[PDB]
């Protein structure tokens, strides 16, 4: 499997690592890829797209890298299963509510409730691992 993410301080990166850990513990392989190193064609080949990005300016996806990545794949993912996650700070998930609506609008099947964790996982480390296990069970 593959996990593609953007992280500015490492919070979402840690989430990605824990999600990967859960998938691996379930017995499957998974590569964790920073959005800046993503290979679109190899990504679109996956049965499930696991995408993560923290909440950025005014509750939006990160603008310089993650956003353009989503835009580029937006027309090639109808019918594709996707799982969304990310870390946030002072808000309550507005950027993720919008991210989910967005992918649904592209025709994606959002397979799990999006995983949102405040700041560094910490107490939520197991929740991250479990989200990965849910995805692996599909
Ligand atoms: C410029 C900027 C804007 C942010 N905007 C939001 C926001 O609108 N809502 C929110 O809950 N957190 C917001 N945050 C907080 C980050 O989402 C939070 O610190 C998160 O843990 C960062 O994860 P990352 O290290 O993976 O980037 C913002 C942070 C930065 C740097």
Residue ranges and CATH numbers for the domains of the chain are: 1-138 (3.40.50.360)
CA dihedral defined by 103, 110, 136, 119, rounded to 10 degrees? 70
Closest CA to 72 of 39, 110, 31: 39
Instruction: Give the determination technique.
Output: X-ray
CB atoms within 10 A of CB 133: 17
> Which residues fall within 8 angstroms of residue 34, CB to CB, at 6 or more apart?
4, 5, 6, 7, 13
Nearest CA to ligand 1 atom 28: 56
35 CA from centroid of ligand 1 (Å):
17
- Resolution reached, in Å? 1.8
The ligand 1 atom nearest the CA atom of 86: 26
Atom of ligand 1 nearest to the CA of 58: 8
Q: Which residues line ligand 1 (CB under 6 A)?
A: 7-12, 54-59, 87-91, 119
**Which residues are 51's β-sheet partners?**
4, 84
């Amino acid at each position: 499997m593959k996990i593609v993410y953007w992280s500015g301080t490492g919070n979402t990166e840690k989430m990605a690592e824990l999600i990967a850990k859960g998938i691996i513990e379930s017995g499957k392989d998974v590569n964790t890829i920073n959005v800046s190193d993503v290979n679109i064609d190899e990504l679109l080949n996956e049965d499930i797209l696991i995408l993560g990005c923290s909440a950025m300016g005014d509750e939006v996806l990160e603008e310089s890298e993650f956003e353009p990545f989503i835009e580029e794949i937006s027309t090639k993912i109808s019918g594709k299963k996707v799982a969304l996650f990310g870390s946030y700070g002072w808000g309550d998930g507005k950027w993720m509510r919008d991210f989910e609506e967005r992918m649904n609008g592209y025709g994606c099947v959002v397979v799990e409730t999006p995983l949102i964790v405040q700041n560094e996982p910490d107490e939520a480390e197991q929740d991250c691992i479990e989200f990965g296990k849910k995805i692996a069970a599909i």
